[PDB]
Amino acid sequence: APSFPFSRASGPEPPAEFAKLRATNPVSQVKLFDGSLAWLVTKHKDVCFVATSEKLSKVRTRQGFPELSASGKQAAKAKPTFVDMDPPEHMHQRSMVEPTFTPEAVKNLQPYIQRTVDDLLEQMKQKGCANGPVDLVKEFALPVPSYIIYTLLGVPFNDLEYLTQQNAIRTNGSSTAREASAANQELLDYLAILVEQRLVEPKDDIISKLCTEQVKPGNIDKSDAVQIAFLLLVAGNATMVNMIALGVATLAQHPDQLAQLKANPSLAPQFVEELCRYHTASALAIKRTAKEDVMIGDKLVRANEGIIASNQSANRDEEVFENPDEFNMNRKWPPQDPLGFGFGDHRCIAEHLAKAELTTVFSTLYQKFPDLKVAVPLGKINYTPLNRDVGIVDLPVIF
Ligand code: HEM
Ligand SMILES: [Br-]
Ligand SMILES: [Br-]
Predict the structure, then answer these.
(1) Enclosing domain of residue 58
(2) Ligand positioned closest to the Cα atom of 149
(3) Is the distance from CB of 21 to CB of 290 less than 8 angstroms?
(4) What triggers production of this protein?
(5) How far apart are CA 81 and CA 228, in angstroms?
C-alpha cells in the first residue's frame, strides 16, 4: 500500500496516481503517516456516495478515523464543532451560523465584497512596483478573504490587519513551532474577548448572533461560541487565498482565456466555476470512518475502517467532465456537480461566499490592472509542497 497524501505530479497538477487508479483501481488502500490504512475513493460517483452515505461518520473520536497529520490526531481531542458532527447534532449546530451564508444573504454582501476588493487593489496601485515586483499574495490574495471573514465574524476595521497577519503566521510552513503556537493562541484570545464584548452589547456580526441566540438562551457556552467562530476562520481562509493566487497564475498559463475574460468580466462566474473544478485547493476534507460494513465499487469497507474520497480526482473524472485536464473557462458543463466544495450535508457552508469573493476578484483585478503580469517564469513559481493541498506561497507581479 502506497503512502497518502500522494504527491502532486507537478507544481500545479494533481497526483499522477489518481488517473491511474480511476482506470484500474477506483477504490484502493493507502498508508497514512501513522502506518494506518484508509480506503481511497477516486471516481466522482463513488465520492458523492461517500459524502452522502448515512453509514459513514465524521466523528473523529471514533476509532479508525483517517487523520493525515500529527496535528490532526491532536485536534481530535477537543470538543467537536459541526464540521466533525453527524446528524442530528451536525445541522443542529450548523444552522446557528448558516443564515449568514445563504445565496440571498451573500448577494447583499456583494457591494461590501466589492468595496473590500476595490480598496485593496487601490492600496496596491498606490504602493506601486517601481523598485521591483510585489507579492500578490501578501498584498491581495491574503487580505481579501481574511478581511471579509473577520468582518463577518465581528472584528472592527482597525484590527483586521494585525489579525490577518497572525492567521497567516499560524499556517506558514516556514514558521517555527513556537511562532505558530503563539499566533494560534492570539487568535483564540481575541475571539474570546469579542464574545465577552458581544454578550454585553451585541452588534451586527456572527459572534453576536451566537451570543444572543445560543450562549444566552443556554444552547451553547462561551467556549463553544469561540470555537465555532474559530472554525469559520480557519476552515476556508487558506483555501481562498490559494484559489485567488492560483487563479491569477492560471490566467497567466492561458493568455487566451485571460483575453476572453478581460474582454468580458461577465464571464468571471463561469471562470471561477472552472477554477474551482480545475484547482481543487481542498482535496483532503471528504473523510469518513464506516459505522458498519459498506460496499464501495468492488471493495468491502468493514466497520470502523477509514475512507478518503478525493474530490480533486473526481473533478478530473473523464467520465463526467470532457477533457478533464484542460482548463476551459467556456467549458460546457455536464449535469453532475463539480466537487470543489464537497457534497451532501457537509458541503462547504461558505460556498456562495467563496464564489462571490472569487467572481469579484477576477471581474475586477484585470480591469484595474490590465498590464498586470507575474514577475517570475511560470516554472519558478513558488507552489505549496507537492505532498500538500495545491496552492501558492508567494506570487510576484507587476502592473
Ligand atoms: C474557494 C475556497 C473554499 C473552498 C474551495 C472550500 C472547500 C470546502 C470543502 C472541500 C469542504 C468539505 C465539504 C464536505 O464535507 O464535503 C469545506 C467545508 C467547510 N468550509 Fe469551505 N471552502 C472554501 C471557502 C470557505 C470559506 C470562505 C469558509 C469560511 C466561512 C469555509 C468554511 C467551511 C466550513 C465551516 C466547512 C465545514 C462544513 C460542514 O462540515 O458542515 N469554506 N469547504
Ligand atoms: Br489571515
Ligand atoms: Br476536500
Answers:
(1) 1-399
(2) 1
(3) no
(4) By nitrate/nitrite.
(5) 6
129: annotated active-site residue: no
How long a stretch of residues is the chain?
399
Residue 65 near ligand 1, beta carbon < 6 Å: no
Is residue 294 within 6 Å of ligand 1 at its C-beta?
A: no
Q: Is 372 in the pocket of ligand 1 (CB under 6 A)?
A: no
Q: Given CA atoms 389, 30, 351, 167 in this order, what sign does their dihedral have?
A: negative
- The 3-class SS string of 116-174 reads HHHHHHHHHHCCCCCCCCEEHHHHHHCHHHHHHHHHHHCCCHHHHHHHHHHHHHHHCCC
Which listed residue (348, 359, 360, 384) is catalytic? 348
Taking CA atoms, 345 is separated from 51, 102, 166, 341, 353, in Å, by 8, 14, 31, 11, 17
| Cell numbers placing 334 | 455536464
Q: Write down the experimental method used for this entry.
A: X-ray
What total number of domains does the chain contain?
Answer: 1
Nearest to 82 by CA among 287, 285, 234, 232: 232
- Give 365's contacts (C-beta < 8 A, 6+ positions apart): 117, 121, 140, 248, 372
Which of the ligands is closest to the CA of residue 284?
3
Annotated binding site for heme: 348
Q: Which residues make Cβ contacts (< 8 Å) with residue 156, sequence separation at least 6? A: none
- Here the CATH number for the domain that contains residue 174 is 1.10.630.10
Query: Using CA atoms, how far apart are residues 292 and 150, in angstroms rounded to an integer?
Result: 40
CA dist list (Å): 6 to 190, 321, 332, 348, 379: 36, 22, 30, 23, 21
Say how far apart CA 75 and CA 73 lie, in whole Å: 6
Written as nine digits, the cell of 374 is: 507575474
For 40, the grid coordinates are 481511497
Nearest Cα to 234, choosing from 111, 99, 75, 95?
Answer: 75
Resolution in Å, one decimal place: 2.0
